[PDB]
Design a binder for this molecule. Structure first.
Ligand SMILES: [Mg+2]
Length: 284
């Protein structure tokens, strides 16, 4: 059990220490495509790069680069695409990736402006009657409906491939209350948001992998995936205290660097898994 392990780290304020053990043990793989000079303006942060083995490739010949990694969790039968918040020049690339990977959902965990600065481009329409057209990738994007709630917004979007004239419906899940500094006081709203994504079908294997992002696509995005996968492994497994959060994290870091950026995000991640265990070990 890891409810027990939480007590001891918290009691002895050892979070920052646990957290460094993870940094040291974490994998390091080449990030060569990302560091090519022709890709410098496709990267929001120069220290956050996809490894070459797990990077998502666009099907354009000129340049196939987008800062995005596929995270494949074999036992849980979950895949995720973690990417950065799009830049003004990568909005068309982003929706091209969503198109090519047959994703059904986009999870966004940041606000467009945080701490007085822009953390993401406004990459979806805000009014039904003003659609967006991405000329470089030949895609049209329309807002269909928008359901605003206390701590999250869900939007139905229509994506049309202008070339082939086909269209798909994409769900945009936008967590809007992650605090500017720190992590939420309680996992309650976050877990409720996670179960809403689950309920929508967007994580299910008939679909492409879900696209998850924040500003760099490693911090809050990492917390989302780590919690989903852990809670899944605790349903699948004979022994629901045989799930080691730290091992799961280290296995996802084989696929994208830096996932979970602070010891506070680590603490919060234990916290949401522990609390989520209640609502899937029968206690509806
Ligand atoms: Mg209106």
């Amino acid at each position: 059990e890891m409810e027990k392990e939480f007590e001891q780290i918290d009691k002895s304020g050892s979070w920052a220490a646990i957290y460094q053990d993870i940094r040291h043990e974490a994998s390091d793989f080449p990030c060569r495509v990302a560091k090519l000079p022709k890709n410098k303006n496709r990267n929001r942060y120069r220290d956050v790069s996809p490894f070459d083995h797990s990077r998502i490739k666009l099907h354009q010949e000129d340049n196939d680069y987008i800062n995005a990694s596929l995270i494949k969790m074999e036992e849980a039968r979950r895949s995720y695409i973690l990417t950065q918040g799009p830049l003004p020049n990568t909005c068309g690339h982003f929706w091209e990736m969503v198109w090519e990977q047959k994703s059904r959902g986009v999870v966004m965990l940041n606000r467009v402006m945080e701490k007085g600065s822009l953390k993401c481009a406004q990459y979806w329409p805000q009014k039904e009657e003003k659609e967006m057209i991405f000329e470089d990738t030949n895609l049209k994007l329309t807002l269909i409906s928008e359901d605003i709630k206390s701590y999250y917004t869900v939007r139905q979007l229509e994506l049309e491939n202008l070339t082939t004239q086909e269209t798909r419906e994409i769900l945009h899940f936008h967590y809007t209350t992650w605090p500017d500094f720190g992590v939420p006081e309680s996992p309650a709203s976050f877990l409720n948001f996670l179960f809403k994504v689950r309920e929508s079908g967007s994580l299910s294997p008939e679909h492409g992998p879900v696209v998850v992002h924040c500003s760099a696509g490693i911090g809050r995005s990492g917390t989302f995936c780590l919690a989903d996968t852990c809670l899944l492994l605790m349903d699948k497994r004979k022994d629901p205290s045989s799930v080691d959060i730290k091992k799961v994290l280290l296995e996802m870091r084989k696929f994208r660097m830096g996932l979970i950026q602070t010891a506070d995000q680590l603490r919060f991640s234990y916290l949401a898994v522990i609390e989520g265990a209640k609502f899937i070990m029968g206690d509806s």
